[PDB]
Design a protein around this ligand. Structure first.
Ligand SMILES: Nc1ncnc2c1ncn2[C@@H]1O[C@H](COP(=O)(O)OP(=O)(O)O)[C@@H](O)[C@H]1O
Ligand SMILES: Nc1ncnc2c1ncn2[C@@H]1O[C@H](COP(=O)(O)OP(=O)(O)O)[C@@H](O)[C@H]1O
Ligand SMILES: Cc1cn([C@H]2C[C@H](O)[C@@H](CO)O2)c(=O)nc1N
Ligand SMILES: Cc1cn([C@H]2C[C@H](O)[C@@H](CO)O2)c(=O)nc1N
Lengths: 241, 230
């Protein structure tokens, strides 16, 4: 019964900012954030006895390892990115909004952006070879088939910001791992988003996506400047779902 | 599922595919899930890369990728076989050529120990494994284990007999390391896992060091009867 809406857009477009403010408008609205923290500090579960005397230690930073050496670390990062996402998304689908009249769960990105934007771009850039790309897609396909329609989207909200805006916002936010990202990299990700969500020319292995409704919102302005009209557009869009 | 799931464990070229292929023929109630080794030497969706070779040749670069794919393809194969085969059989048994537990606590673990995977790769692999099995752990849980015991020297010889190109450079001491993990898991039972049910699972240990021209009859009957106790 929970409607599932993906917020899509480039790095530092303003997705987290927008959606976590937006969700306050209704007790029936919740967000699943992207597990970026879990990527910059890699941890696995402690044993039940061990956790009582041993601290959960800071782990490696796979996000940073990927940015430093994408040709070595991209496949590892993308596999983990998508696994951590699915785990978090399924749990919120299963455990939240059990008392909502019109429950909406907003996902910060989707398994589709993992594959068709980010990993695809890494492949195109030869940061993943043929074997890695085949394995990744094989895995991604298998996992999607395993769930029925459970993660399937009801709608996508595309926050469209220029590569230049995103580059500035990466600096504003100050994530250490992202400070070396050049404009050329953001432009590549921009183009993939435009093909997928705006021009709608991008073909995926998931045919329902060809027909999922998409709301495109320009987020280039300062947050106060367009927020009202954005909220109005979002609410009108949800009414149609 | 009411399908009995039995894992066949043992070192490289101990004789597991050979044994399970013999076993299979005893009843129409018995099926096998082989390791999809062909998918590992020829990477393809559903002539590609040989990720088995890439791992053996460059294990600090390729071990994690290989271990992830191997386990993923096993879970895929094992689940398919449950979903479709036997079910409606009298006393269904499914024999697995290895398990998700040997993937992790034998193969991947040895790679981490040998520094072929770093801390980050090992932590990611364990997180991946815990989760992948939290969904599919229940449906794949083992009823029994058959441990096919062969010396590292026997295994090295059989690697030669079989002639898989990728394996011809594996040294005796690599086989020794895998042997020690098997014995610790299945004989000494000193290897502890994240899966508490396993400590309860009965194990039939079979010595397969001898030429099969010899004592194979006893072994097979001895399985037929182990399964009666389950
Ligand atoms: N419309 C906006 N105007 C000014 N700053 C913004 C706007 N939207 C987001 N930000 C800021 O830009 C940075 C990136 O936003 P964030 O929501 O973290 O992006 P994303 O979730 O898409 O990666 C943050 O520092 C946030 O303060
Ligand atoms: N008991 C045995 N005696 C003689 N040869 C054997 C015996 N078991 C296996 N072999 C041979 O050894 C090789 C490895 O056996 P295989 O069943 O493929 O091993 P695994 O599946 O354990 O890797 C094959 O060439 C096989 O014909
Ligand atoms: C989903 C996702 C995100 N990122 C990066 C972009 C940001 O630097 C950080 C947070 O989204 O992770 C990535 O490389 N690949 C992905 N599949
Ligand atoms: C399951 C499994 C197998 N192998 C190797 C041993 C053999 O060379 C080949 C076929 O089992 O793959 C491996 O390195 N890691 C695994 N998790």
């Amino acid at each position: 019964r929970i409607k599932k809406i993906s917020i899509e857009g480039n790095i530092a477009a303003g997705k987290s900012t927008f959606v976590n403010i937006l969700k306050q408008l209704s007790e029936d609205w919740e967000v699943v954030p992207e597990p970026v923290a879990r990527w910059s500090n890699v941890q696995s579960t402690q044993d039940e006895f061990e956790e009582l005397t041993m601290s959960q230690k800071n782990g490696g930073n796979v996000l940073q390892m990927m940015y430093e050496k994408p040709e070595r670390w991209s496949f590892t990062f993308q596999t983990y990115a998508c696994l951590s996402r699915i785990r978090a998304q399924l749990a919120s689908l299963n455990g939240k909004l059990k008392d909502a009249e019109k429950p909406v769960l907003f996902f910060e990105r989707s398994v589709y952006s993992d594959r068709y934007i980010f990993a695809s771009n890494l492949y195109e850039s030869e940061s993943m070879n043929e074997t890695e790309w085949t394995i990744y897609q094989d895995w991604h396909d298998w996992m999607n088939n395993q769930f029925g329609q459970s993660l399937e989207l009801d709608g996508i909200i595309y926050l469209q910001a220029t590569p230049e805006t995103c580059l500035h916002r990466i600096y504003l936010r100050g994530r250490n791992e992202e400070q070396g990202i050049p404009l050329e990299y953001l432009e590549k990700l921009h183009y993939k988003h435009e093909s997928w969500l705006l021009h709608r020319t991008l073909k995926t292995n998931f045919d329902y996506l060809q027909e999922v409704p998409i709301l495109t919102l320009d987020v280039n302005e300062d947050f106060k400047d367009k927020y009202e009209s954005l909220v109005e557009k979002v609410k009108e869009f949800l009414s149609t779902l």
